[PDB]
Amino acid sequence: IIGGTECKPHSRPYMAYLEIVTSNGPSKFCGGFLIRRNFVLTAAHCAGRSITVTLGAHNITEEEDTWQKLEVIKQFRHPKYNTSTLHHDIMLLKLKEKASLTLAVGTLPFPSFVPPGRMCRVAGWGRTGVLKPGSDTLQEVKLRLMDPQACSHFRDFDHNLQLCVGNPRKTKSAFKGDSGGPLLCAGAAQGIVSYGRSDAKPPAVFTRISHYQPWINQILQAN
Numbered sequence: 001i002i003g004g005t006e007c008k009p010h011s012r013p014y015m016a017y018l019e020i021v022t023s024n025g026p027s028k029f030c031g032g033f034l035i036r037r038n039f040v041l042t043a044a045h046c047a048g049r050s051i052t053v054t055l056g057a058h059n060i061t062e063e064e065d066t067w068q069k070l071e072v073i074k075q076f077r078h079p080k081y082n083t084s085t086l087h088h089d090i091m092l093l094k095l096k097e098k099a100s101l102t103l104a105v106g107t108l109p110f111p112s113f114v115p116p117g118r119m120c121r122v123a124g125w126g127r128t129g130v131l132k133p134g135s136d137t138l139q140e141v142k143l144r145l146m147d148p149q150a151c152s153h154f155r156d157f158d159h160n161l162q163l164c165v166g167n168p169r170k171t172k173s174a175f176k177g178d179s180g181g182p183l184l185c186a187g188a189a190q191g192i193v194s195y196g197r198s199d200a201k202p203p204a205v206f207t208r209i210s211h212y213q214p215w216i217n218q219i220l221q222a223n
């Protein structure tokens with residue numbers, strides 16, 4: 001997160017921190033969010049050979065008694081996930097066991113009107129600048145949902161599938177490692193951090209959750 005502030009600890013109890021062993025071996029981290037006791041929603045490009053989720057965290061380098069660390073038993077990448085167009089960057093993770101709902105660990109509701117111009121919030125443990133490490137503490141920033149035309153420089157941007165997030169006239173932005181985290185507008189999950197410019201200039205591109213709700217329901221109903 002760039003230009004944000006440290007979250008009040010545990011004030012965003014749906015937040016998941018993902019440790020990912022990629023197929024090759026090198027580790028990666030992403031954000032995500034709890035939507036059922038045993039399901040986390042995140043970005044598909046965060047898939048790997050194995051994933052562990054940490055719920056209830058604030059400083060991710062220091063365990064607290066609020067922590068629930070759960071192994072992922074199955075990854076469900078969207079079937080149309082496309083590395084050429086970067087479309088359909090969304091994935092459900094089934095946890096090996098159900099998390100316990102507590103004050104520090106809870107689920108995030110879905111919606112079902114947010115047009116360009118609305119102010120949203122995104123939280124994550126991603127890098128806090130181009131030459132900065134990931135943040136040890138959960139950070140959050142308020143970002144403007146932009147008209148899709150503000151992302152017209154991104155090849156293949158599709159307003160039906162994606163959101164354009166972050167005023168280009170300011171430096172505030174989601175950034176590397178915030179991928180998979182939710183964009184919250186009016187207390188509902190509206191987007192998932194997907195990608196952006198390496199040089200951190202907003203806007204960034206998010207997956208539009210509303211478009212995928214029937215797929216999410218399909219996966220949940222079959223589990």
Ligand SMILES: *[C@@H]1O[C@H](CO)[C@@H](O[C@@H]2O[C@H](CO)[C@@H](O)[C@H](O)[C@H]2NC(C)=O)[C@H](O)[C@H]1NC(C)=O
Binds near residue numbers: 059060062136137
């Ligand atoms: C996040 O937690 C880590 C680990 O406890 C903190 O880093 C430690 O900080 C203490 C001083 O407070 C040092 O003596 C240790 O050497 C640090 N450990 C490591 C692994 O670096 C860190 O300060 C915490 N971050 C915040 C913002 O509170």
Ligand SMILES: *[C@@H]1O[C@H](CO)[C@@H](O[C@@H]2O[C@H](CO)[C@@H](O)[C@H](O)[C@H]2NC(C)=O)[C@H](O)[C@H]1NC(C)=O
Binds near residue numbers: 080081082083084085
């Ligand atoms: C990723 O998206 C690309 C572009 O839409 C897909 O390639 C197109 O696939 C259709 C299949 O009917 C063809 O008609 C086009 O000619 C293809 N375009 C190009 C540039 O090859 C591609 O198949 C998708 N990949 C996945 C994994 O679904």
Ligand SMILES: CP(=O)(O)[C@H](C(=O)N/C=C/c1ccc(F)c(F)c1)c1csc2ccc(Cl)cc12
Binds near residue numbers: 179
């Ligand atoms: C390192 P990261 O956080 O995981 C992120 C990334 O590489 N996204 C890739 C997406 C994607 C989507 C579909 C695909 F099929 C696919 F192969 C990849 C990233 C790189 S620069 C940047 C700047 C702002 C933000 Cl928010 C994230 C990013």
